[PDB]
Amino acid sequence: SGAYWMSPTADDIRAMNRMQRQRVVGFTVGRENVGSVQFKVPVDLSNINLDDLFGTIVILEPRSATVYPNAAKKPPMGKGLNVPALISLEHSWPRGGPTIKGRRLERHIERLKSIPDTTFESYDPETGVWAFSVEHFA
C-alpha cells in the first residue's frame, strides 16, 4: 500500500482556467511503493472528477497500472487519459528476486524489452524499477 498523488495537484488543476484544464501538460499519477503513470501529451481534464480518480480511473497496485477499468466507460484512443504514457513500476526484479545478477539479469532485461504492447524505456537493477511506454490503454 501507499498514498496516491497527482501532479499537477488536484488543487493546481482546479485553479487553472478553462483553456488550461483542457490541455494539462506533465500530468502524472503515482502511488507510493508502486510507481507512476506520466502522460506524454497534454490531457483534457475538464470533464474528469479529480476527487474520484485514484483507485477508480487510475489504479496502481504493485506491478499493475490500469487506466479506465470499466470497459463500457473508457473513452476512445486520444481522448481523456487514453493517450500515450510512460509507466514506471517498482518490484520488477527477475523472477528469482532482487539478488539475481550476472547473465540471468542480462536476460531478464532482454525479456522486459520483449513484453508485448510495451516500448521498453529502462530497467534499473539497483531499484528494481522497469519503465516503459504505451501508446494508449486500449
JSON list of N, CA, C and O in Angstrom, two decimals, residues 81-118:
[
{"chain": "A", "resi": 81, "resn": "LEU", "atom": "N", "xyz": [-7.69, 10.24, -20.61]},
{"chain": "A", "resi": 81, "resn": "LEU", "atom": "CA", "xyz": [-6.40, 9.69, -20.26]},
{"chain": "A", "resi": 81, "resn": "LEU", "atom": "C", "xyz": [-6.00, 8.49, -21.13]},
{"chain": "A", "resi": 81, "resn": "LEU", "atom": "O", "xyz": [-4.99, 7.84, -20.84]},
{"chain": "A", "resi": 82, "resn": "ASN", "atom": "N", "xyz": [-6.75, 8.19, -22.19]},
{"chain": "A", "resi": 82, "resn": "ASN", "atom": "CA", "xyz": [-6.45, 7.06, -23.06]},
{"chain": "A", "resi": 82, "resn": "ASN", "atom": "C", "xyz": [-5.49, 7.51, -24.15]},
{"chain": "A", "resi": 82, "resn": "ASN", "atom": "O", "xyz": [-5.80, 7.57, -25.34]},
{"chain": "A", "resi": 83, "resn": "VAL", "atom": "N", "xyz": [-4.28, 7.83, -23.70]},
{"chain": "A", "resi": 83, "resn": "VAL", "atom": "CA", "xyz": [-3.29, 8.53, -24.51]},
{"chain": "A", "resi": 83, "resn": "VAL", "atom": "C", "xyz": [-1.92, 7.94, -24.21]},
{"chain": "A", "resi": 83, "resn": "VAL", "atom": "O", "xyz": [-1.75, 7.19, -23.23]},
{"chain": "A", "resi": 84, "resn": "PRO", "atom": "N", "xyz": [-0.90, 8.31, -24.97]},
{"chain": "A", "resi": 84, "resn": "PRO", "atom": "CA", "xyz": [0.45, 7.79, -24.69]},
{"chain": "A", "resi": 84, "resn": "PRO", "atom": "C", "xyz": [0.93, 8.13, -23.28]},
{"chain": "A", "resi": 84, "resn": "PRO", "atom": "O", "xyz": [0.70, 9.23, -22.76]},
{"chain": "A", "resi": 85, "resn": "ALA", "atom": "N", "xyz": [1.62, 7.17, -22.66]},
{"chain": "A", "resi": 85, "resn": "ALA", "atom": "CA", "xyz": [2.05, 7.34, -21.27]},
{"chain": "A", "resi": 85, "resn": "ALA", "atom": "C", "xyz": [3.33, 6.57, -21.04]},
{"chain": "A", "resi": 85, "resn": "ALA", "atom": "O", "xyz": [3.59, 5.55, -21.68]},
{"chain": "A", "resi": 86, "resn": "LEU", "atom": "N", "xyz": [4.09, 7.05, -20.05]},
{"chain": "A", "resi": 86, "resn": "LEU", "atom": "CA", "xyz": [5.30, 6.40, -19.56]},
{"chain": "A", "resi": 86, "resn": "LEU", "atom": "C", "xyz": [4.99, 5.84, -18.19]},
{"chain": "A", "resi": 86, "resn": "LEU", "atom": "O", "xyz": [4.69, 6.60, -17.25]},
{"chain": "A", "resi": 87, "resn": "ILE", "atom": "N", "xyz": [5.12, 4.53, -18.05]},
{"chain": "A", "resi": 87, "resn": "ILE", "atom": "CA", "xyz": [4.74, 3.82, -16.82]},
{"chain": "A", "resi": 87, "resn": "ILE", "atom": "C", "xyz": [6.02, 3.33, -16.17]},
{"chain": "A", "resi": 87, "resn": "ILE", "atom": "O", "xyz": [6.87, 2.75, -16.85]},
{"chain": "A", "resi": 88, "resn": "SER", "atom": "N", "xyz": [6.15, 3.55, -14.87]},
{"chain": "A", "resi": 88, "resn": "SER", "atom": "CA", "xyz": [7.34, 3.12, -14.15]},
{"chain": "A", "resi": 88, "resn": "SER", "atom": "C", "xyz": [6.87, 2.31, -12.96]},
{"chain": "A", "resi": 88, "resn": "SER", "atom": "O", "xyz": [6.12, 2.83, -12.13]},
{"chain": "A", "resi": 89, "resn": "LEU", "atom": "N", "xyz": [7.31, 1.07, -12.88]},
{"chain": "A", "resi": 89, "resn": "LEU", "atom": "CA", "xyz": [6.83, 0.13, -11.87]},
{"chain": "A", "resi": 89, "resn": "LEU", "atom": "C", "xyz": [7.96, -0.43, -11.03]},
{"chain": "A", "resi": 89, "resn": "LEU", "atom": "O", "xyz": [8.88, -1.09, -11.54]},
{"chain": "A", "resi": 90, "resn": "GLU", "atom": "N", "xyz": [7.88, -0.20, -9.72]},
{"chain": "A", "resi": 90, "resn": "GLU", "atom": "CA", "xyz": [8.74, -0.85, -8.75]},
{"chain": "A", "resi": 90, "resn": "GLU", "atom": "C", "xyz": [8.49, -2.37, -8.73]},
{"chain": "A", "resi": 90, "resn": "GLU", "atom": "O", "xyz": [7.51, -2.88, -9.28]},
{"chain": "A", "resi": 91, "resn": "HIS", "atom": "N", "xyz": [9.43, -3.08, -8.12]},
{"chain": "A", "resi": 91, "resn": "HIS", "atom": "CA", "xyz": [9.26, -4.51, -7.82]},
{"chain": "A", "resi": 91, "resn": "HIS", "atom": "C", "xyz": [9.30, -5.38, -9.07]},
{"chain": "A", "resi": 91, "resn": "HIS", "atom": "O", "xyz": [8.70, -6.45, -9.11]},
{"chain": "A", "resi": 92, "resn": "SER", "atom": "N", "xyz": [10.01, -4.92, -10.09]},
{"chain": "A", "resi": 92, "resn": "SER", "atom": "CA", "xyz": [10.07, -5.59, -11.38]},
{"chain": "A", "resi": 92, "resn": "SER", "atom": "C", "xyz": [11.33, -6.43, -11.55]},
{"chain": "A", "resi": 92, "resn": "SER", "atom": "O", "xyz": [11.77, -6.67, -12.68]},
{"chain": "A", "resi": 93, "resn": "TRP", "atom": "N", "xyz": [11.85, -6.95, -10.43]},
{"chain": "A", "resi": 93, "resn": "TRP", "atom": "CA", "xyz": [13.03, -7.78, -10.34]},
{"chain": "A", "resi": 93, "resn": "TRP", "atom": "C", "xyz": [12.88, -9.04, -11.19]},
{"chain": "A", "resi": 93, "resn": "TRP", "atom": "O", "xyz": [11.76, -9.47, -11.49]},
{"chain": "A", "resi": 94, "resn": "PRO", "atom": "N", "xyz": [14.00, -9.67, -11.50]},
{"chain": "A", "resi": 94, "resn": "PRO", "atom": "CA", "xyz": [13.99, -11.03, -12.05]},
{"chain": "A", "resi": 94, "resn": "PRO", "atom": "C", "xyz": [13.09, -11.94, -11.24]},
{"chain": "A", "resi": 94, "resn": "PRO", "atom": "O", "xyz": [12.80, -11.67, -10.05]},
{"chain": "A", "resi": 95, "resn": "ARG", "atom": "N", "xyz": [12.65, -13.03, -11.85]},
{"chain": "A", "resi": 95, "resn": "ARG", "atom": "CA", "xyz": [11.73, -13.94, -11.19]},
{"chain": "A", "resi": 95, "resn": "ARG", "atom": "C", "xyz": [12.28, -14.42, -9.86]},
{"chain": "A", "resi": 95, "resn": "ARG", "atom": "O", "xyz": [11.52, -14.59, -8.90]},
{"chain": "A", "resi": 96, "resn": "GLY", "atom": "N", "xyz": [13.58, -14.65, -9.77]},
{"chain": "A", "resi": 96, "resn": "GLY", "atom": "CA", "xyz": [14.22, -15.07, -8.54]},
{"chain": "A", "resi": 96, "resn": "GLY", "atom": "C", "xyz": [14.45, -13.98, -7.50]},
{"chain": "A", "resi": 96, "resn": "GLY", "atom": "O", "xyz": [15.01, -14.26, -6.44]},
{"chain": "A", "resi": 97, "resn": "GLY", "atom": "N", "xyz": [14.04, -12.75, -7.78]},
{"chain": "A", "resi": 97, "resn": "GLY", "atom": "CA", "xyz": [14.09, -11.68, -6.80]},
{"chain": "A", "resi": 97, "resn": "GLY", "atom": "C", "xyz": [15.26, -10.73, -6.96]},
{"chain": "A", "resi": 97, "resn": "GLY", "atom": "O", "xyz": [16.04, -10.81, -7.91]},
{"chain": "A", "resi": 98, "resn": "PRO", "atom": "N", "xyz": [15.42, -9.83, -5.98]},
{"chain": "A", "resi": 98, "resn": "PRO", "atom": "CA", "xyz": [16.43, -8.77, -6.09]},
{"chain": "A", "resi": 98, "resn": "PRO", "atom": "C", "xyz": [17.87, -9.26, -6.10]},
{"chain": "A", "resi": 98, "resn": "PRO", "atom": "O", "xyz": [18.76, -8.50, -6.52]},
{"chain": "A", "resi": 99, "resn": "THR", "atom": "N", "xyz": [18.13, -10.48, -5.65]},
{"chain": "A", "resi": 99, "resn": "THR", "atom": "CA", "xyz": [19.51, -10.96, -5.56]},
{"chain": "A", "resi": 99, "resn": "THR", "atom": "C", "xyz": [20.03, -11.54, -6.88]},
{"chain": "A", "resi": 99, "resn": "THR", "atom": "O", "xyz": [21.20, -11.90, -6.94]},
{"chain": "A", "resi": 100, "resn": "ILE", "atom": "N", "xyz": [19.20, -11.64, -7.92]},
{"chain": "A", "resi": 100, "resn": "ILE", "atom": "CA", "xyz": [19.63, -12.22, -9.20]},
{"chain": "A", "resi": 100, "resn": "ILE", "atom": "C", "xyz": [20.48, -11.22, -9.96]},
{"chain": "A", "resi": 100, "resn": "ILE", "atom": "O", "xyz": [20.07, -10.07, -10.18]},
{"chain": "A", "resi": 101, "resn": "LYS", "atom": "N", "xyz": [21.65, -11.67, -10.42]},
{"chain": "A", "resi": 101, "resn": "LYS", "atom": "CA", "xyz": [22.62, -10.80, -11.09]},
{"chain": "A", "resi": 101, "resn": "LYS", "atom": "C", "xyz": [23.25, -11.56, -12.25]},
{"chain": "A", "resi": 101, "resn": "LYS", "atom": "O", "xyz": [22.80, -12.65, -12.63]},
{"chain": "A", "resi": 102, "resn": "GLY", "atom": "N", "xyz": [24.28, -10.97, -12.84]},
{"chain": "A", "resi": 102, "resn": "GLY", "atom": "CA", "xyz": [25.03, -11.64, -13.88]},
{"chain": "A", "resi": 102, "resn": "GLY", "atom": "C", "xyz": [24.24, -11.88, -15.15]},
{"chain": "A", "resi": 102, "resn": "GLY", "atom": "O", "xyz": [23.39, -11.09, -15.56]},
{"chain": "A", "resi": 103, "resn": "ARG", "atom": "N", "xyz": [24.55, -13.01, -15.78]},
{"chain": "A", "resi": 103, "resn": "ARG", "atom": "CA", "xyz": [23.97, -13.35, -17.07]},
{"chain": "A", "resi": 103, "resn": "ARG", "atom": "C", "xyz": [22.44, -13.42, -17.01]},
{"chain": "A", "resi": 103, "resn": "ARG", "atom": "O", "xyz": [21.76, -12.98, -17.95]},
{"chain": "A", "resi": 104, "resn": "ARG", "atom": "N", "xyz": [21.89, -13.97, -15.93]},
{"chain": "A", "resi": 104, "resn": "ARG", "atom": "CA", "xyz": [20.44, -14.05, -15.82]},
{"chain": "A", "resi": 104, "resn": "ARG", "atom": "C", "xyz": [19.82, -12.66, -15.76]},
{"chain": "A", "resi": 104, "resn": "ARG", "atom": "O", "xyz": [18.75, -12.42, -16.32]},
{"chain": "A", "resi": 105, "resn": "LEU", "atom": "N", "xyz": [20.48, -11.74, -15.06]},
{"chain": "A", "resi": 105, "resn": "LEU", "atom": "CA", "xyz": [19.98, -10.38, -15.01]},
{"chain": "A", "resi": 105, "resn": "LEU", "atom": "C", "xyz": [20.01, -9.74, -16.39]},
{"chain": "A", "resi": 105, "resn": "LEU", "atom": "O", "xyz": [19.08, -9.03, -16.77]},
{"chain": "A", "resi": 106, "resn": "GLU", "atom": "N", "xyz": [21.04, -10.04, -17.18]},
{"chain": "A", "resi": 106, "resn": "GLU", "atom": "CA", "xyz": [21.07, -9.56, -18.56]},
{"chain": "A", "resi": 106, "resn": "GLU", "atom": "C", "xyz": [19.89, -10.11, -19.35]},
{"chain": "A", "resi": 106, "resn": "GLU", "atom": "O", "xyz": [19.24, -9.37, -20.10]},
{"chain": "A", "resi": 107, "resn": "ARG", "atom": "N", "xyz": [19.57, -11.41, -19.21]},
{"chain": "A", "resi": 107, "resn": "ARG", "atom": "CA", "xyz": [18.46, -11.98, -19.96]},
{"chain": "A", "resi": 107, "resn": "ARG", "atom": "C", "xyz": [17.13, -11.43, -19.49]},
{"chain": "A", "resi": 107, "resn": "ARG", "atom": "O", "xyz": [16.19, -11.29, -20.28]},
{"chain": "A", "resi": 108, "resn": "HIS", "atom": "N", "xyz": [17.01, -11.17, -18.18]},
{"chain": "A", "resi": 108, "resn": "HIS", "atom": "CA", "xyz": [15.80, -10.54, -17.64]},
{"chain": "A", "resi": 108, "resn": "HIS", "atom": "C", "xyz": [15.53, -9.23, -18.34]},
{"chain": "A", "resi": 108, "resn": "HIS", "atom": "O", "xyz": [14.40, -8.95, -18.78]},
{"chain": "A", "resi": 109, "resn": "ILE", "atom": "N", "xyz": [16.57, -8.41, -18.49]},
{"chain": "A", "resi": 109, "resn": "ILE", "atom": "CA", "xyz": [16.41, -7.13, -19.16]},
{"chain": "A", "resi": 109, "resn": "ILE", "atom": "C", "xyz": [15.97, -7.34, -20.61]},
{"chain": "A", "resi": 109, "resn": "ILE", "atom": "O", "xyz": [15.08, -6.65, -21.11]},
{"chain": "A", "resi": 110, "resn": "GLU", "atom": "N", "xyz": [16.57, -8.31, -21.29]},
{"chain": "A", "resi": 110, "resn": "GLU", "atom": "CA", "xyz": [16.17, -8.59, -22.66]},
{"chain": "A", "resi": 110, "resn": "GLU", "atom": "C", "xyz": [14.72, -9.06, -22.74]},
{"chain": "A", "resi": 110, "resn": "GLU", "atom": "O", "xyz": [13.99, -8.68, -23.66]},
{"chain": "A", "resi": 111, "resn": "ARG", "atom": "N", "xyz": [14.26, -9.84, -21.76]},
{"chain": "A", "resi": 111, "resn": "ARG", "atom": "CA", "xyz": [12.87, -10.27, -21.79]},
{"chain": "A", "resi": 111, "resn": "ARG", "atom": "C", "xyz": [11.92, -9.11, -21.47]},
{"chain": "A", "resi": 111, "resn": "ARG", "atom": "O", "xyz": [10.82, -9.04, -22.03]},
{"chain": "A", "resi": 112, "resn": "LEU", "atom": "N", "xyz": [12.31, -8.19, -20.58]},
{"chain": "A", "resi": 112, "resn": "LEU", "atom": "CA", "xyz": [11.49, -7.00, -20.38]},
{"chain": "A", "resi": 112, "resn": "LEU", "atom": "C", "xyz": [11.33, -6.23, -21.68]},
{"chain": "A", "resi": 112, "resn": "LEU", "atom": "O", "xyz": [10.26, -5.69, -21.96]},
{"chain": "A", "resi": 113, "resn": "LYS", "atom": "N", "xyz": [12.39, -6.18, -22.50]},
{"chain": "A", "resi": 113, "resn": "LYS", "atom": "CA", "xyz": [12.30, -5.45, -23.76]},
{"chain": "A", "resi": 113, "resn": "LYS", "atom": "C", "xyz": [11.27, -6.07, -24.69]},
{"chain": "A", "resi": 113, "resn": "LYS", "atom": "O", "xyz": [10.70, -5.36, -25.54]},
{"chain": "A", "resi": 114, "resn": "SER", "atom": "N", "xyz": [10.99, -7.36, -24.55]},
{"chain": "A", "resi": 114, "resn": "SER", "atom": "CA", "xyz": [10.09, -8.06, -25.45]},
{"chain": "A", "resi": 114, "resn": "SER", "atom": "C", "xyz": [8.65, -8.18, -24.93]},
{"chain": "A", "resi": 114, "resn": "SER", "atom": "O", "xyz": [7.83, -8.82, -25.59]},
{"chain": "A", "resi": 115, "resn": "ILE", "atom": "N", "xyz": [8.32, -7.58, -23.80]},
{"chain": "A", "resi": 115, "resn": "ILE", "atom": "CA", "xyz": [6.95, -7.67, -23.30]},
{"chain": "A", "resi": 115, "resn": "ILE", "atom": "C", "xyz": [5.99, -7.05, -24.31]},
{"chain": "A", "resi": 115, "resn": "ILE", "atom": "O", "xyz": [6.13, -5.86, -24.67]},
{"chain": "A", "resi": 116, "resn": "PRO", "atom": "N", "xyz": [4.99, -7.80, -24.77]},
{"chain": "A", "resi": 116, "resn": "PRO", "atom": "CA", "xyz": [4.08, -7.27, -25.79]},
{"chain": "A", "resi": 116, "resn": "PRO", "atom": "C", "xyz": [3.36, -6.01, -25.35]},
{"chain": "A", "resi": 116, "resn": "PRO", "atom": "O", "xyz": [3.03, -5.82, -24.18]},
{"chain": "A", "resi": 117, "resn": "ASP", "atom": "N", "xyz": [3.11, -5.14, -26.32]},
{"chain": "A", "resi": 117, "resn": "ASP", "atom": "CA", "xyz": [2.31, -3.94, -26.13]},
{"chain": "A", "resi": 117, "resn": "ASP", "atom": "C", "xyz": [2.97, -2.97, -25.17]},
{"chain": "A", "resi": 117, "resn": "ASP", "atom": "O", "xyz": [2.29, -2.18, -24.51]},
{"chain": "A", "resi": 118, "resn": "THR", "atom": "N", "xyz": [4.29, -3.03, -25.07]},
{"chain": "A", "resi": 118, "resn": "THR", "atom": "CA", "xyz": [5.06, -2.04, -24.33]},
{"chain": "A", "resi": 118, "resn": "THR", "atom": "C", "xyz": [6.27, -1.65, -25.16]},
{"chain": "A", "resi": 118, "resn": "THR", "atom": "O", "xyz": [6.74, -2.43, -26.00]}
]
